[PDB]
Design a protein around this ligand. Structure first.
Ligand SMILES: [Mg+2]
Ligand SMILES: [Mg+2]
Ligand SMILES: [Mg+2]
Ligand SMILES: [Mg+2]
Ligand SMILES: [Mg+2]
Ligand SMILES: [Mg+2]
Ligand SMILES: [Mg+2]
Lengths: 233, 217, 243, 213, 199, 201, 250, 238, 234
């Protein structure tokens, strides 16, 4: 027989900080890196899927997940927490569509999921999600790229990174690329910004990438991946 | 139950010196259809009490289920305590009344037969919760065809023997067969005595149709 | 739902959460009240006239019904809640019964609310004391006070909040049949009491009163400087002309 | 469809004298045009000075009876004393009212002694409306028994008569008469007539015989 | 059977109701009042079923008053009508629907005089003049006939006088007296009852 | 049943027959239809016996609590208003109640009529019951707020009697109560048989 | 269970709620934000914190929220916490509009949201929201009004005020340079860039390091707008390109 | 003390202090004794008075015609348990029209009082009980403790200095079964006296007796009613 | 040290209940005496200021015409118990149409005894005991009676009893003066004599409450004058 803790597990310290949230971010800063680029003509998501411990079947699980026909995700942090948020985003995505008959506007999906993440920083008996997400979408012509973290706060980026060396991965992009970048272009400068930390032999199974153009969102196959890898394609 | 489906007709019960006897045909009718011709409408509730049910057989099976668990439960304690005939009859009255009060009755009229402390127990229970004790009981059509005979006998000899009684039951089970259109000349007889509860296999009665040949005359 | 017991007894028989609530009341803007015979008065001290403020949106004085009103001292937010709960009870006492709300009845109601909140799981007590004013329609004019403990009493005059102890010591030495034997002088003793601890300026006060039948009246800073002069100089016709 | 009620007949009568109360009822329990049993009196002892009779739907009389019994036990544990005839009556009223919207089809009559030692009788309708009376009858023979009592026990419609108190002896025969006359016209009344007499000495029972038809 | 009438002028609103409380074949009360005070510039004329009228009326009443105590200022007659409409319409499909028909007469020191009519179904409409009850059938045509958007309160009390006389003539229900009241920039003012010399 | 109450200069008069029927059968003629709520409040019984007794008894309970909590007797309006409220919840469920709540407030004589239909009104005079229409007749022709105490007694007592005459469901004895500022007094209680050998005897 | 509960809604020996005070702390570190009241309008100016050369920012603002049709507000504190209190603010507005069919009186929309925060401090065992808000709007009762709210469930109407970083240096400044009764939306926007230039560790207070919004009447319908990049700088230069002209007087 | 405040916390020794502490509540209560012949169950108890102007505490309570009890420990908990016990009995009569078998009632107290000892925030019942009853299995004397445990006894006593009484009872057990009532009661009164300070003994003011048996429904005796039993005492070992 | 409100001490006593018994010792003192001719209750209001209406302080209240009750301790708490009592007496009268004995009433109130707790509890549930001691004085079928009840939920009858800060002393005096045969007249005198002693302030007719209930007269709260009359014999 189970009861439940009704007091919040996140509380302001005298410094005015919300300790658990910071610590959550620490779990993020310690996770596999992720990069997102808004190519003013689409968006790209890519992360370090370095599992493949020779026994791990890289296939069976993904980190770049489709929310709707036109939305997509990637994270940096605790994998299990992510999965929860993926099921909730996909769900939130449907509750919108049933009511409005129009696919959910990317900004709107972000707001909704962010609200959830915020919920877990005040509700009783729980800890904040140890994860940060990068949502990408094509809603009404313009491409979108967002990031929401443990606190439940979100921002729209032209491009960014999270996880290990996200500090360096950002500065790198802070110059190593800019707007007007076309499709395949933003994809290259993305897999590159990844290698700017990717320790090891970055192959087609060490990474996973998805793109979101104004014609749907999808994950690229090991093929199209092995290609871009050869420093081109 | 709001609409009885498969049902059993009348049930009889009379007490004698050192025991009680109950009779009930083995018919499960579905309207005017003698559908299930071989089902027992009698039950043994522990060693000193037995029960016979008229009405919706499904509900009866239900009561049989709950009462069986109750007896089992009690036996597990082996604390030297066990439901008496009056107790079972009391519980049944509470149960039948409770359900009647929820407007969802168990469609049965029942005869509780028991023996405990050298005394004979015989009790009646409605689906509405009307309950009482008496030397003879007859439900369904039996209340119009059997009870007048049973009383007749008892108003002239209050004390019968297991044999005198079984003789009366057979006579009644015959009258019932002759006049109740939903009876079956294939019944059971349950008896309770210091020895316990005994149920007797498929029985029948000699029937006399010689009046059939008196059309013209 | 949160069931923790917030207010509990201590070794010597104390209810700290209540005593703490009472402390928050202490750190509040003083508030005094005097019971006359034709007009009861109330004034809220340390009104911290930040000027960049806005008088209306913060007057520690409120009306509950058309025959009752109150002043408080303590946690601002709490007061609001309690104020609007008594307001509701006021109208509901008219739907259940037909007659209006009494002087005491409503006060008792507020005390009962506070007391309850010192004995219910999940809740903290209300950090405010209240000076309830009103005339007992078809009777005398009464004055009552309440503290977080949930206890309540009728006062001839009283003060709660910052230095209320002082103003109380004072009030106890100025109340007499004679002292304020007329509405003009009644509203005076309060004016004096408040000032007898109230920061210099007069722009720190916010008095007001209710008539034994008329609506409520929140005095204007004008009628303020006037009654604040009728004594500012009266505090010289015996202190600067006999001293 | 399904009715949760049945009419079992049977009448109940009670009279209160200076120092005694009588409660009588036939003993027949029927249904339809049949007789369930000839031995089913409607009188039951609640305390040493309080008796109740219930008629109507036997299912309800049984349940009601068991509820009253339990509640007296509760009262005893709670106040350390037995319930006075008057309190039992007050209680029965509320018990009947709790089923105001699904009534106990029951007509109860309480017969006993008040705290002052005198006789008392309380009559109730199925939903608890009640009062105290000198005498009252409820049930099928109800309208058969009453009239004779209004005349004999109330000296009504009689000019220049002697308003002598109801001697327990005269009462006991009035009871037997009205029930014997009723047994003649009400198909529900018959078989036997049990009487319960309540006095300072206790409760005494007497069973007179009636037509078995 | 209860009658309600209201005529809106350019600067005021005149309203009236009968004073009979009927039951079976008898008038049980000679001086019954169908009007309820909500604000200083608002009245709620309510008629209908035995308990629903008072219960509902007072409920909307005390809730308007509560609004006064909570914000300091009163609700505009226009805002009250939408309030009362909200509740009545919200109870319509509840377990406790209120079977009442009403008129809401009020004056706004900014919008002017206003008269609202309402269905027990909670349909809300603004109108220059309106009535409820069987009387309405025998008198609404009169108003259509003699009402002018500028009728002065002297005229209005006369137009009302006409409708009231009509009921003494055609209507089969007794209805001897009628409470009358006016509302202008200076609040709710009573008026003498319009009565008829019947024993 | 026939009940009535009117208030004049000397308070409030309340009278009633005492007959209770079950169809056509007279089940009793010793019914106390003037319910002694409190020594300061009176109620009547019309419609359902149990319904009136129970709720008003409940009202008595509520009034007593009120008094203990406010060291003041509850006002007639307040009391009648409690009863109205208690009962309104069940509107539509079959409660049958026709009663008049009478007393003396801080407003003077008080009389309210309350229904299980939801009605609740203050008035000078009221008649309730199957025989009410008859009582109204004689009472209306004879009622004056200025009646003298012994005059008011005769009127009320007469009205109820006349009703017991025409209405088959009204009869027995005629009960009469007088509500004075201090408390109520049980004026008289006379059989109809007697009252007849007087109004014409 | 009793062991892990921090008791976020209890009194301290002092008689204060420590979790409220700590929320404040968080507030006095957030992007500065203030509003001033004129006679033809009312405004809000906040320290745009999401300042960075990579963000794509696609919103009308970053800290300016449209509540009512006659109202808007700004926040200082935890943004997520803020998105929650505003959403609820919009709902309270509409519920009023539905029920009364008229825009909700400004102060009332505030007392509403305040009763909720007040609650989070009296019961529930939950932490209060780490937010303080500035409310500006117009209503047929007090026309233009500016309001401020604390996570304590406390509020007040201000002719002028500030929240956030150095929300002390900002006050006193306005507390003396404010035209109490003689303010124009122009003389208002004046102190705006003046005070923000001060309390804001920024030299030559760029157009991005700020967000401006103004509410005004205009032939019936209320108008709410956030100044465009250019429109901002006009007041940027105007401030300085008048300041050097202020030292030629000393 | 990390293992002393919650009944849901086991100590490193496989004990639950809260339970033990509650047991302490029993020991504090004044002593009471229980014993049965083969036809009677008897409860005997010593009542205490706060001051001399106050009455002595109830220690024996009537549960049902065939059951009564004596208490030791928190009074409020005794009333809770007593009422549960009373209710359970009323139900038995209602449904089965027969008295609730004493042993079955005891099993219910056992189950009921066990629950709170296993849930966070709950506390053990703080009362012991001696139960005297008579069912179709004869007389019975049961004991129930703050720990949901219960015992079927030949004789027993709980409370302050009840160790003496136990000792006295253990010595004359063999005698009990064949005692006639008055003798059985004496053994009880005698055992109780064992728990007192030598310079004082049984008064008609501090003794209470409860008797139930094949021939009598549970009955309580408290003041003058206790005399008949106190007469014919015993020297009282000096 | 933080534990549940329902924790036992090694001594087998609930901390909270013990800690409130303590709170009573901080209340004003009240005395109740029981005579064959009636019962009386007296308590020191313990006024803390001239500006406070001595009348707006009732430590003695009516439960019902035949029952009065005096309190001490956290008076705010007693409000609740007092109401439950009045309500109880009426439920009994409603149901049984007869008055409730003084013992049953006291008992009814005592069942709210240890009705406090956290987990596994309703929302409108007490979180701590009531820091109150009570004295129920009244007359019923068993004659005049006085009962005492503290927070443990325990209650008993007393010929005379005292509660409050001066309780220990007061009770000593009561033991010296009580007579199984004294009178309601003698009783009231003793009460005031003793109350006068223990009070820190000089016994005024405006700083004490006295009330009686006798086999004939229904509960009576002594007037300002009737006090003068008895105080006259200091
Ligand atoms: Mg990752
Ligand atoms: Mg059916
Ligand atoms: Mg301000
Ligand atoms: Mg004071
Ligand atoms: Mg029988
Ligand atoms: Mg609307
Ligand atoms: Mg509604």
């Amino acid at each position: 027989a189970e009861r439940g803790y009704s007091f919040s597990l996140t509380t302001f310290s005298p410094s005015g900080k919300l300790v658990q949230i910071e610590y959550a971010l620490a779990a993020v800063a310690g996770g596999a890196p992720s990069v997102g680029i808004k190519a003013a003509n689409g968006v790209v998501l890519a992360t370090e899927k370095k599992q493949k411990s020779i026994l791990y079947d890289e296939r069976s699980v993904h980190k770049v997940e489709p929310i709707t026909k036109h939305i997509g995700l990637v994270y940096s942090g605790m994998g299990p927490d992510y999965r929860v948020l993926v099921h909730r985003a996909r769900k939130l995505a449907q509750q919108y569509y049933l009511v409005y008959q129009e696919p959910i506007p990317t900004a709107q999906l972000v707001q909704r999921v962010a609200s959830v993440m915020q919920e877990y920083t005040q509700s009783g008996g729980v800890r904040p999600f140890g994860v940060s997400l990068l949502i990408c979408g094509w809603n009404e012509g313009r491409p979108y790229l967002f990031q929401s973290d443990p606190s439940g706060a979100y921002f729209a980026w032209k491009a960014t990174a999270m996880g290990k060396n996200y500090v360096n991965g950002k500065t790198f992009l802070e110059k190593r690329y800019n707007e007007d970048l076309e499709l395949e272009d933003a994809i290259h400068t993305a897999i590159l910004t990844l290698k700017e930390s990717f320790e090891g032999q970055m192959t087609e199974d060490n990474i996973e990438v998805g793109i979101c153009n104004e014609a749907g969102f999808r994950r690229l196959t090991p093929t199209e991946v092995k290609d871009y890898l050869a420093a081109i394609a | 139950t709001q609409n009885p489906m498969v049902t059993g007709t009348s049930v009889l019960g009379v007490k004698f010196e050192g025991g009680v006897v109950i009779a009930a045909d083995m018919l499960g009718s579905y309207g005017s259809l003698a559908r299930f011709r071989n089902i027992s409408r009698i039950m043994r509730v522990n060693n000193s009490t037995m029960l016979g049910a008229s009405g919706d057989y499904a509900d009866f099976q239900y009561l049989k289920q709950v009462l069986g668990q109750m007896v089992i439960d009690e036996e597990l304690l082996g604390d030297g305590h066990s439901y008496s005939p009056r107790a079972i009859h009391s519980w049944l009255t509470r149960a039948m009344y409770s359900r009647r009060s929820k407007m969802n009755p168990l469609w049965n009229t029942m005869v509780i037969g028991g023996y405990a402390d050298g005394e004979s127990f015989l009790g009646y229970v409605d689906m509405l919760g009307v309950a009482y004790e008496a030397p003879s009981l007859a439900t369904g059509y039996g209340a119009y065809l059997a009870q007048p005979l049973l009383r007749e006998v008892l108003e002239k000899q209050p004390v019968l023997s297991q044999t005198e009684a079984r003789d009366l039951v057979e006579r009644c089970m015959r009258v019932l067969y002759y006049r109740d259109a939903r009876s079956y000349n294939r019944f059971q007889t349950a008896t309770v005595t210091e020895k316990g509860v005994e149920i007797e296999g498929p029985l029948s009665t000699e029937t006399n149709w010689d009046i059939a040949h008196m059309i013209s005359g | 739902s949160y069931d923790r017991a917030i207010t509990v007894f201590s070794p010597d028989g104390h209810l700290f959460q209540v005593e703490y609530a009472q402390e928050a009341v202490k750190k509040g803007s003083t508030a005094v009240g005097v019971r006359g015979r034709d007009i009861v008065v109330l004034g809220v001290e340390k009104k911290s006239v930040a000027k960049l403020q806005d008088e209306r949106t913060v007057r520690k004085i409120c009306a509950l019904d058309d025959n009752v009103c109150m002043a408080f001292a303590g946690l601002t937010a709490d007061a609001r809640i309690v104020i609007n709960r008594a307001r509701v009870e006021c109208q509901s006492h008219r739907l259940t019964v037909e007659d209006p709300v009494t002087v005491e009845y409503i006060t008792r109601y507020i005390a009962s609310l506070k007391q309850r909140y010192t004995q219910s799981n999940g809740r903290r007590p209300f950090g405010i004391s209240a000076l309830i004013v009103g005339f007992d329609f078809d009777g005398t004019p009464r004055l009552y006070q309440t503290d977080p403990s949930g206890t309540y009493h009728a006062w001839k005059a009283n003060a709660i909040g910052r230095g209320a102890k002082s103003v109380r010591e004072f009030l106890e030495k100025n109340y007499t049949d004679e002292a304020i034997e007329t509405d003009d002088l009644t509203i005076k003793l309060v004016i004096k009491a408040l000032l007898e601890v109230v920061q210099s300026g007069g722009k720190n006060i916010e008095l007001a009163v209710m008539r034994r039948d008329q609506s409520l009246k929140i005095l204007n800073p004008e009628e303020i400087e006037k009654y604040v002069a009728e004594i500012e100089k009266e505090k010289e016709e015996n202190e600067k002309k006999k001293q | 469809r399904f009715s949760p009620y049945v009419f079992n007949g049977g009448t109940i009568l009670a009279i209160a004298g200076e120092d005694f109360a009588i409660v009588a009822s036939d003993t027949r329990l029927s249904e339809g045009f049949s007789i369930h049993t000839r031995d089913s009196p409607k009188c039951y002892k609640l305390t040493d000075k309080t008796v109740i009779g219930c008629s109507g739907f036997h299912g309800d009389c049984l349940t009601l009876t068991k509820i009253i019994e339990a509640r007296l036990k509760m009262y005893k544990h709670s106040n350390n004393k037995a319930m006075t005839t008057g309190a039992i009556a007050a209680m029965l009223s509320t018990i009947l009212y709790s089923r105001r919207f699904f009534p106990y089809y029951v007509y109860n009559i309480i017969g006993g002694l008040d705290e002052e030692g005198k006789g008392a009788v309380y009559s109730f309708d199925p939903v608890g409306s009640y009062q105290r009376d000198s005498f009252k009858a409820g049930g099928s023979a109800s309208a058969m028994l009453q009239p004779l009592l209004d005349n004999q026990v109330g000296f009504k419609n009689m000019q220049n008569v002697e308003h002598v108190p109801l001697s327990l002896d005269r009462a006991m025969r009035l009871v037997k008469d009205v029930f014997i006359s009723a047994a003649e016209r009400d198909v529900y009344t018959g078989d036997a007539l049990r009487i319960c007499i309540v006095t300072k000495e206790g409760i005494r029972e007497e069973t007179v015989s009636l037509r078995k038809d | 059977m209860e009658y309600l009438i209201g005529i809106q002028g350019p600067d005021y609103v005149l309203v009236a109701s009968d004073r009979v409380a009927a039951s079976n074949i008898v008038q049980m009360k000679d001086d019954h009042d169908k009007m309820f005070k909500m604000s200083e510039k608002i009245l709620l004329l309510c008629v209908g079923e035995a308990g629903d009228t008072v219960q509902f009326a007072e409920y909307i009443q005390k809730n308007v008053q509560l609004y006064k105590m909570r914000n300091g200022y009163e609700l505009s007659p226009t805002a009250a009508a939408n309030f009362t409409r909200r509740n009545l319409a919200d109870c319509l499909r509840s377990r406790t629907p209120y079977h009442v028909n009403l008129l809401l007469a009020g004056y706004d020191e900014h919008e002017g005089p206003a008269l609202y009519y309402m269905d027990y179904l909670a349909a809300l409409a603004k109108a220059p003049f309106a009535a409820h009850g069987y009387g309405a059938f025998l008198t609404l045509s009169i108003l259509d006939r003699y009402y002018t958007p500028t009728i002065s309160r002297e005229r209005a009390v006369e137009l009302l006088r006409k409708c009231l006389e009509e009921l003494q003539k055609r209507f089969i229900l007794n209805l001897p007296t009628f409470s009358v009241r006016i509302i202008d920039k200076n609040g709710i003012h009573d008026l003498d009852n319009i009565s008829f010399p019947k024993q | 049943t026939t009940t009535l109450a009117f208030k004049f200069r000397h308070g409030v008069i309340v009278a009633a027959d005492s007959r209770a029927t079950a169809g056509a059968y007279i089940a009793s003629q010793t019914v106390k239809k003037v319910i002694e709520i409190n020594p300061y409040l009176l109620g009547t019984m019309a419609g359902g016996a149990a319904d009136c007794s129970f709720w008003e008894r409940l009202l008595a309970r509520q009034c007593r609590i009120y008094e203990l909590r406010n060291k003041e007797r509850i006002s007639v309006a307040a009391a009648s208003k409690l009863l109205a409220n208690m009962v309104y919840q069940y509107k539509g469920m079959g409660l049958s109640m026709g009663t008049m709540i009478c007393g003396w407030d801080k407003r003077g004589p008080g009389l309210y009529y309350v229904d299980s239909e939801g009605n609740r009104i203050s008035g000078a005079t009221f008649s309730v019951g199957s025989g009410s229409v008859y009582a109204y007749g004689v009472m209306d022709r004879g009622y004056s707020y200025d009646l003298e105490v012994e005059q008011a007694y005769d009127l009320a007592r007469r009205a109820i009697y006349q009703a017991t005459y025409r209405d088959a469901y009204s009869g027995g004895a005629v009960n009469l109560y007088h509500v004075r500022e201090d408390g109520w007094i049980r004026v008289s209680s006379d059989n109809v048989a007697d009252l007849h050998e007087k109004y014409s005897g | 269970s009793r062991r892990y509960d921090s008791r976020t809604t209890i009194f301290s020996p002092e008689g204060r709620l420590y979790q409220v005070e700590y929320a404040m702390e968080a507030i006095g570190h957030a992007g500065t934000c203030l509003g001033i009241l004129a006679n033809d309008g009312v405004l809000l100016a906040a320290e745009r914190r999401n300042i960075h050369k990579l963000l794509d920012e696609v919103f009308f603002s970053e800290k300016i929220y449209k509540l009512n049709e006659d109202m808007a507000c700004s926040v200082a504190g935890i943004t997520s916490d803020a998105n929650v209190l505003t959403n609820e603010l919009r709902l309270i507005a509409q519920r009023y509009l539905l029920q009364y069919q008229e825009p909700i009186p400004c102060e009332q929309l505030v007392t509403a949201l305040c009763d909720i925060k007040q609650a989070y401090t009296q019961f529930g065992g939950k932490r209060p929201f780490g937010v303080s808000l500035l409310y500006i709007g117009w209503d047929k009762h007090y026309g233009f009004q500016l309001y401020q709210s604390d996570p304590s469930g406390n509020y007040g109407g201000w002719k002028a005020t500030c929240i956030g970083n150095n929300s002390a240096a900002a006050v006193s400044m306005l507390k003396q340079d404010y035209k109490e009764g003689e303010m124009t939306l122009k003389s208002a926007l004046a102190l705006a860039i003046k005070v923000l230039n001060k309390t804001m560790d920024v030299s030559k207070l760029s157009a991005e390091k700020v967000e401006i919004a103004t509410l005004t009447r205009e032939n019936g319908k209320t108008v709410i707008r956030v100044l465009k990049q250019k429109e901002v700088e006009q007041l940027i230069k105007k401030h300085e390109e008048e300041e050097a002209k202020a030292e030629r007087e000393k | 003390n990390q293992y002393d405040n919650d009944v849901t916390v086991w100590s490193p020794q496989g004990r639950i202090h809260q339970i033990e502490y509650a047991m302490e509540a029993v020991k504090q209560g004044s002593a009471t004794v229980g014993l049965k012949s083969k036809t009677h169950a008897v409860l005997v108890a010593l009542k205490r008075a706060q001051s001399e102007l106050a009455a002595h505490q109830k220690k024996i309570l009537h549960v049902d015609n065939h059951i009564g009890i004596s208490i030791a420990g928190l009074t409020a908990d005794a009333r809770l348990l007593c009422n549960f016990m009373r209710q359970e009995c009323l139900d038995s009569r209602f449904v089965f029209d027969r008295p609730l078998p004493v042993s079955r009632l005891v099993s219910l107290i056992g189950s009921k009082t066990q629950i709170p000892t296993q849930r966070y925030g709950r506390r053990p019942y703080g009362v012991g009980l001696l139960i005297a009853g008579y069912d179709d299995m004869g007389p019975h004397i049961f004991q129930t403790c703050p720990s949901a445990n219960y015992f079927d006894c030949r004789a027993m006593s709980i409370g302050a200095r009840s160790q003496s009484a136990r000792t006295y009872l253990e010595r004359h057990m063999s005698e009990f079964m064949e005692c006639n009532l008055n003798e059985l009661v004496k053994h009880g009164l005698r055992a109780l006296r064992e728990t007192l300070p030598a310079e004082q003994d049984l008064t008609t003011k501090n003794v209470s007796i409860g008797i139930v048996g094949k021939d009598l429904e549970f009955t309580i005796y408290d003041d003058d009613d206790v005399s008949p039993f106190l007469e014919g005492l015993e020297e009282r070992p000096q | 040290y933080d534990r549940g409100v329902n924790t036992f001490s090694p001594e087998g006593r609930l901390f909270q209940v013990e800690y409130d018994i303590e709170a009573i010792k901080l209340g004003s003192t009240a005395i109740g005496i029981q005579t064959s001719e009636g019962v009386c209750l007296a308590v020191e209001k313990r006024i803390t200021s001239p500006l406070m209406e001595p009348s707006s302080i009732e430590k003695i209240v009516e439960i019902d015409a035949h029952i009065g009750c005096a309190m001490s301790g956290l008076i705010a708490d007693a409000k609740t118990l007092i109401d439950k009592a009045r309500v109880e007496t009426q439920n009994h009268w409603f149901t049984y149409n007869e008055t409730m004995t003084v013992e049953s009433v006291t008992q009814a109130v005592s069942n709210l005894a240890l009705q406090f707790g956290e987990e596994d509890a309703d929302p409108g549930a007490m979180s701590r005991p009531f820091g109150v001691a009570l004295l129920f004085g009244g007359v019923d079928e068993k004659g005049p009676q006085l009962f005492h009840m503290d927070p443990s939920g325990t209650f008993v009858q007393c010929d005379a009893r005292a509660i409050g800060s001066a309780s220990e002393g007061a009770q000593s005096s009561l033991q010296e003066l009580y007579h199984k045969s004294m009178t309601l007249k003698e009783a009231i005198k003793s009460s005031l004599i003793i109350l006068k002693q223990v009070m820190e302030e000089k016994l005024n007719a405006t700083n004490i409450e006295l009330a009686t209930v006798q086999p004939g007269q229904n509960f009576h709260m002594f007037t300002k004058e009737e006090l003068e009359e008895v105080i006259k014999d200091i």
